[PDB]
Structures are given as C-alpha cells and as structure tokens.
Amino acid sequence: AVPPSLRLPVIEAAFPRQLHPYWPKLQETTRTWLLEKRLMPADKVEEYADGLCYTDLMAGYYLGAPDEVLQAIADYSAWFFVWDDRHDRDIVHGRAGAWRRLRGLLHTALDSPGDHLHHEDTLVAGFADSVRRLYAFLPATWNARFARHFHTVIEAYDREFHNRTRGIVPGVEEYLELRRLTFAHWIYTDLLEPSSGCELPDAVRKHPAYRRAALLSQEFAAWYNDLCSLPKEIAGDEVHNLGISLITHHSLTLEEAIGEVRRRVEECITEFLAVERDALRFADELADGTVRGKELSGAVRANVGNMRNWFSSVYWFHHESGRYMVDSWDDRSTPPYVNN
C-alpha cells in the first residue's frame, strides 16, 4: 500500500523485484558484522537492524554477484548508512572537529585500508574492513577507480556538513550535481563490475549507452529517496533534498514540490528504458564470436540488468525500511536507530 503521492505504477508493473539467493544468510551475516564491529549499539541492532532492510536493498540490486562480493557490498552499504547517521549527528551536535578528523581518516583508510582495520573509531575500522575486502576482487586498476570516486564522495559529505552548519540550502542545479556524489552514483556503478566478475574496459563502460543507463539508474534512486525521505528530513532539519531546494529557492508549496520531484523521477524511468535498449544492443555487438567478446557482452548484460534491478529494489526499500517511518517514531526529529 504505497501512498498515492509516492506510488509509481510503471515500477510496480514493469520492474518486477528480484532477490539474490544468498539474502537469508546475508541478512544474518551483516547484522553480526554490525555487532562485531560495534557500528550500532547492540540494543539498537537487536531492535532495528533487520527492520532497516539494508541487506534487502543490495540483495535486490547486485543479482548474480558471488556471495563473498555481495557480503562485502552489503557490509560496506550498511556502514554507509551508519556513516550518514554519524554525519547527521555530528552536524546537529556541532562537532566540527570530530567530523574533520573522521573525514581525514576515511581519506587515508580509503588508500590503505589494511592499516586501519583496528582503528579506535569503530566507524573507521568498519569502513577499512569492508573496503579491504572490496579491493580483493578485481585488478588494482579497478581499486584505484573506486578510490578516486570515493575521495570525491567524502568531500561531498564535507560540503553538506558546511551547508547545514551555515544554514545554506543549495540551488536546484548545485544540488543535482552534489547529489551524484552524496548518493555515491559512481561507487555503486563501480560495484557492478566485481558483481559480474569483470573489470570493464573504458571503451565499454564509457560507451554513451552504458554511461547513460548507469546515470539514470542512480538519478531515479537518489530522487526517489528525496521524495520518500522528505518527511523525516524536514523533521530533522536536513537541507539536502530536491524538494527542499525547490521550496526554498522557487516558492513552491510542499504539495507542488512533491509533484515536481515525482515527475522528474518518472522521466528517469522512461529515459532509462530507451537507453537500456541501446545498451543491450551494444552488448549484442560485443558478442562477436570470441571468448573475450562473449565475456564483455555477458558482463554488460548483467550490469545493465542490475541497473534495472536498482529501480525496483530502491522503490520497495523506501516503503519497507524502518529508516523512513517517521510517523511511528516517538520523536520525529530524532530517529530511534541513530546514536544520539
């Protein structure tokens, strides 16, 4: 029962959900990882971890991934949500120094995760553990691209810290650019490749159809999060949300801003369907009767398939996850799963 302001019939009719067979063990293993890495208090892990659906989200995304790859992705992604919470709490507590030091350690750990596996900040240690494992799947050229992308992501989170401390709501276009980094568009595009077992040549992953399909998948997901997380973000004095940029800088009502965000989300779907056809045509061309061409074509088909799976996984995640159920919280402004 999706609220009509949030319901997308095209997703419900034409993007059937998919689920990785490892998900039952994935849910248990990531929960244990959160406990053993002390990324959330044990009582909050017990009450909320499964209800947050972080493993469900990724198991509906990276279909076909080796179990060990999916486990590293799920641990990294659960860490990422907890990092978003830490970021938020440092902002509302005014802990500029604590955030600066964390930001610095993540940059260093990103380049040398082994050195940081037992850092006193368990949030740094958990990052290092998941990143070191992600670095063990593909050649070092893929590792360097992941690092390059995530250095940029950290600095976008730092820009958000300064915005919220200074009381700045970004403009629409500045927000749209920033959001491709705070949502980690290019990290989760990178992770398609270990999931299908193949570092893609630049001429393949930078093909205009591959690049556009990857972009639209993430824009849909980011803007649909904006639509669904707007209530809890308004309650929490978050300022980063396409709807908030529209209300602040364009005199839209709340109902009008929600309408504009929804129509932009909808356009992502139908733009994706067009480029998806082009990307699969490119896959057909790559299958030229050679083993390498069969390998590249198969990787493109899997990766573009998972770009499509991202639509349905993100859609249902926002209605199943306790992360967004602000009407059920004792304090709408302080979600019960965050460490305050």
Ligand SMILES: CC[N+](CC)(CC)Cc1ccccc1
């Ligand atoms: C890993 C989660 N993420 C990615 C940067 C930060 C919170 C946003 C996200 C929210 C909801 C669904 C998917 C991704």
Ligand SMILES: [Mg+2]
């Ligand atoms: Mg957030």
Ligand SMILES: [Mg+2]
């Ligand atoms: Mg955030």
Ligand SMILES: [Mg+2]
């Ligand atoms: Mg959000």
